[PDB]
Amino acid sequence: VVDLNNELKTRREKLANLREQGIAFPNDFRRDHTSDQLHAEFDGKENEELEALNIEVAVAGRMMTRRIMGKASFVTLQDVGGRIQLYVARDDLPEGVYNEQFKKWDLGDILGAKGKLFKTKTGELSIHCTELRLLTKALRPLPDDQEARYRQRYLDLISNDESRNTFKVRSQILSGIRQFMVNRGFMEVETPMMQVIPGGAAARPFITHHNALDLDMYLRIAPELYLKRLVVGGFERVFEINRNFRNEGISVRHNPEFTMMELYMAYADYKDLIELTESLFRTLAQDILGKTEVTYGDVTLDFGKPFEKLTMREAIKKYRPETDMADLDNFDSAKAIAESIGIHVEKSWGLGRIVTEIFEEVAEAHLIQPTFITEYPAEVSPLARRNDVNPEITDRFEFFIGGREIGNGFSELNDAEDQAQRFLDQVAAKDAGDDEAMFYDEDYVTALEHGLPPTAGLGIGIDRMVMLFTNSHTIRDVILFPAMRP
Amino acid sequence: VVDLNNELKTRREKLANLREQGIAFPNDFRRDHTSDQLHAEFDGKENEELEALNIEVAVAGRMMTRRIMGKASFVTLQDVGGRIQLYVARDDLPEGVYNEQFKKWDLGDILGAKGKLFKTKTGELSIHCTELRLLTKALRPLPDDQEARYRQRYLDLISNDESRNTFKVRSQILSGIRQFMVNRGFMEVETPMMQVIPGGAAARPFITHHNALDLDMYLRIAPELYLKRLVVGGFERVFEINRNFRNEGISVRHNPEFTMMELYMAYADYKDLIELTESLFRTLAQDILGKTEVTYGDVTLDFGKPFEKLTMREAIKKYRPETDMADLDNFDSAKAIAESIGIHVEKSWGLGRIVTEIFEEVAEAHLIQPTFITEYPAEVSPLARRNDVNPEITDRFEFFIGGREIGNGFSELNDAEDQAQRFLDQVAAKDAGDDEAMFYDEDYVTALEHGLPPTAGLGIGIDRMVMLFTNSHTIRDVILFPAMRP
Ligand SMILES: N[C@@H](CCCC[NH3+])C(=O)O
Ligand SMILES: N[C@@H](CCCC[NH3+])C(=O)O
């Protein structure tokens, strides 16, 4: 309440005094151990050992908790790898430090300590300090909606062990993805974030202006088209992990800027990539989580049993059994069905979009276990190769875990004449009402004209993947600094 | 001249015919070797061996060159890892293929081939084809200012072996940087690209608007301030490799969006990072280039001899020996010197800026061998810890190789009261004429108030590093898709 402004004014005056005494913010203390290391190597030893071993250490961290017992105290110190106990004794430190200084410090303050190890009555490992000092004065006290954890992630990180575990694991996932890709000869590239024409996905984009060149640019909604140019140029196995910016809304399972991986391999089809995705997940879970059966909320995600495969038509029939599939071949009856399950059909929608929507509604949520849905109507797949036997559908697949879309992949359209026509279609839909349709891209049609080998491309939502790997149930739990509404 | 439009119209009609015959863009051919692999494992064998070994292969690539010799031909095929020879014989292929098809294909076309290996009269390894077919029709012919190589990098990549070598090595550098960092316990993070207030460097930024939140955002000129928040939160060894966007101009050694690495380690100072940089380069060169002495243009960069260390004052005196250092302590005389060497002094400049400028001019170009310049006036170092003995300078360093700045690092300012005052300074300079000054950042002052441990941070220009590693002499040689003027 008002506790805070007193805390501020006290911590304030304490610093102005520290300045008069000398150098308030020293940067010469050097530690040599972190809690996790100390615990790891020494929690298996007893006090008869330690006293005789006489192993001295130096550590630094944030003073979390301090139990003052007159002429001796106990402080809990928290560093990058955990918390460690300190026994602070007035006579075992230099003269005056414990009284004129230590007792005058505050919780939140960063300290440095050095002393021999031992174990307290409780069995906890501790450092009997011979030296201890203030490194950084916390002008503000430790912490105390749940959106506070997102406006000031450092506070959350200091407090919540799980967050720090979550992100540590995120790094392990990326590191493991890269290790995996390179092992299959994929080379990582960096294409532009700014683009003169945005594309490679369906989304309203962010506009920016290059002051100098008098030119509007765009934050990339996807790097797809540039990565395919690299395949034209002869990089036959490229992948890229980085942002995309979609001017959508901050609806919790969304963030305006997220992390995606795209990978392309020439002389392969969507199947080759379906099978690649399997190994990616099944291998990462095993390596990063030890087990193949993985707990996510109420369910146990079985990454060990072969991922399920259904075509869209199959999925529609499986989750809406009363469905007369024959109605899905006709426009009026398919619109009837779509509206009978409560979908508002846009004026710009054609049959394939309607069917795709119906699938979205009736089935997506039920795909809890790792699932691949295949064979999408051409309409909704502007960059995908047509199917040989049925041109009305494309060699395309989506991938779902936990009722969410974790992946997307297809046999690439390298038919430039067709690719250009699908752009005109996308441009028509845009004029017709679709704020998410694609822009026509001449330079790309051209790149294709020079020849794009047959190729299969795969996109994967890195954030959502981490969620399923760390048991997070909002994307804001896997993004260090989510975009917060003012 | 007009050759092109004939080539187009011919390649056009050839495709319309292919469509009538069947599926023009097949995606079922599967290769099993790349040129580099074939050359690597088989260029050490003679023809008496090969004929008896009878090793069959399948490959695919772009038809680069075709010497038609009547009832037999030779084609050069180029894939991700090089070129490989094909012996195409009318009778050794299925009936009709060589005449009704092969001879009707074009250069640029992507093909797939299968056949037994052997060696021609010249000693070159080749594939005596039993099967060969068209995968992708090149509706446009192969290639033929030098800016063409940048407007259509796929063309350049197809033609120029060195480009493809350059980028392959870039990947190796990044991969090696990450390997290096993680080996020292650094954890990689991803902070925002969009930011409500831009900062962490001096540069005019790119503005964008989030349509929904009615809020202007900015492309990050640097991620510095967010990475330091992570150190407040307890990640004591973080690093991040990703873009920065500076609304500068496309002046060849610049690109509006480039790749930077930042790394922070708590309980360390600028020295600890100077020494880290040494190992980074010396180790990468050795690993990636085999040698420590490395050729760059006219000079041999000696990464083996200990990097040179000079303070700015030292450097000024070394490259302008007639300089009376005493004049550098006074404002009018230091401005006199600056203007006597042809520097226009801005109305908003103070002594430290003037001296820094003088250094820039007189010395930067001469720093050819790996060099660290230390001790920068406070004025030009808004986020750096003051020096204990001399508050007028900061514990800061720049790093130079080849007359260019490859690095930047300092002991971090964790004095919130001072940090806020330096912002007011930056805000003053901005109002006074500096299009590159910093914005005031409240949320950051606050993060510091909660306490930032003593820390040292290091920034490194990844692109410029690659240049020096691949002998490129423009940044546009290390960026797959440089920003080209319309
Ligand atoms: N660009 C796609 C991912 C790759 C699709 C296959 N070419 C997306 O944003 O979903
Ligand atoms: N943010 C700096 C790099 C890190 C400086 C040390 N904290 C730059 O853009 O040059």
The atom number, within ligand 1, closest to the CA of A260 reads 9
Report whether residue B408 contacts ligand 2, using a CB cutoff of 6 Å.
yes
Q: Which residues line ligand 1 (CB under 6 A)?
A: A 200-201, 222, 224, 262, 408-410, 457-459
Q: How far is the CA of A293 from the centre of ligand 1 (A)?
A: 28
Last residue of a domain, one of A143, A174, A197: A143
Tell me the binding residues of B: 398, 405
B129 close to B72: Cβ distance less than 8 angstroms: no
- CA distances to B346, B352, B369 from B313, rounded to whole Å, are 21, 11, 19
The parent domain of residue A341 ranges over 145-485
User: Please, which residues bridge with residue A209 across strands?
Assistant: A216
Q: Cα dihedral sign for A118, A120, A124, A130?
A: negative
Question: Which residue lies with its CA nearest to atom 3 of ligand 2?
Answer: B459
Q: What is the DSSP string of A264-313?
A: EEES--HHHHHHHHHHHHHHHHHHHHS-SEEEETTEEEESSSPPEEEEHH
- Bridge partners of A262? A240, A459
Tell which atom from ligand 2 comes closest to the C-alpha of B383.
7
Same-domain status, B293 and B254? yes
Provide φ and ψ at A262, rounded to 5°.
-115, 145
Q: For residue B132, give the CATH number of its domain.
A: 2.40.50.140
Angstrom CA distances, A157 to A65, A80, A317, B452, stand at 17, 10, 46, 13
Regarding the beta carbon of B410 and ligand 2, being less than 6 Å apart is answered yes
Q: Is A27 exposed, middle or buried (0-12, 13-18, 19+ CB in 10 A)?
A: buried
Resolution (A): 2.7
Residues A49 and A127 in one domain: yes
Q: Are residues B172 and B23 in the same domain?
A: no
Asked whether B236 and B275 are in contact (CB, 8 A), the reply is no
Nearest to A233 among B158, B230, B266 (CB): B158
Residues B48 and B96 in one domain: yes
For residues B104 and B154, state if they share a domain.
no
User: Which one of A232, A267, A485 has the shortest CB-CB distance to B31?
Assistant: A267
The verdict on whether residue A398 carries a ligand-binding annotation is: yes
* Domain's final residue, options B116, B143, B170: B143
Ligand 1 centre to CA of A242 (Å) is 13
A269 contacts A277 by C-beta, under 8 angstroms = no
Q: Which of B81, B109, B143 represents a domain boundary (last residue)?
A: B143
Round the CA-based radius of gyration of chain B to a whole number and report it. 29
- Which residue matches tokens 């069959």? B56
Within B389-468, strands assigned E span 393-401, 404-411, 455-461
Are residue A37 and residue A184 in the same domain, yes or no?
Answer: no
Identify whether the C-beta of residue B486 lies closer than 8 Å to the C-beta of residue A213.
yes
Q: Do A362 and A219 sit in the same domain of this protein?
A: yes
Handedness of CA A411, A416, A422, A428 (dihedral sign): positive
Count of the separate structural domains present in chain A: 2
DSSP structure class, residue A386: B
Terminal C-alpha separation, chain B: 23
Nearest CA to ligand 1 atom 9: A201
Domain co-membership, A367 together with A470: yes
**For residue B255, with 0-12 CB atoms within 10 Å meaning exposed, 13-18 middle and 19 or more buried, which class applies?**
buried
Smallest Cα distance from B404 to chain A, Å: 23
Are B137 and B185 in a shared domain? Answer: no
* Closest residue to atom 3 of ligand 1, CA basis: A459
Does residue B200 share a domain with residue B68?
Answer: no
* 8 A C-beta contact, residue A241 and residue B188: no
Residues A121 and A178 in one domain: no
- The residues with which B266 forms a beta bridge, in sequence order, are B455
DSSP states of A168-190 as a string? HHHHHHHHHHHHHHHTTT-EE--
Method underlying the structure? X-ray
Question: Are residues A188 and A238 both part of a single domain?
Answer: yes
| Closest C-alpha to A175, from A441, A484, A462, A397 | A462
Strands B371-377 and B308-311 come out as parallel
Q: What is the CATH number of the domain that holds A150?
A: 3.30.930.10
Chain B nearest C-alpha distance from A448 (Å) = 8
Only one residue has tokens 């299925």, namely B94
Sequence-distant (6+) residues with CB within 8 A of B468 are B294, B296, B301, B401, B402, B406
User: Between B78, B108, B449, which is nearest A450 by CB?
Assistant: B108
8 Å CB contact of A154 and B447: yes
Alpha carbons B455 and B236: distance in angstroms, whole number: 8
How many whole angstroms from B275 Cα to the centroid of ligand 2? 17
Is the distance from CB of B50 to CB of B119 less than 8 angstroms? yes
Q: Residues 6 or more apart from B280 whose CB is under 8 A from it?
A: B177, B180, B460
Ligand nearest to the CA of B452: 2
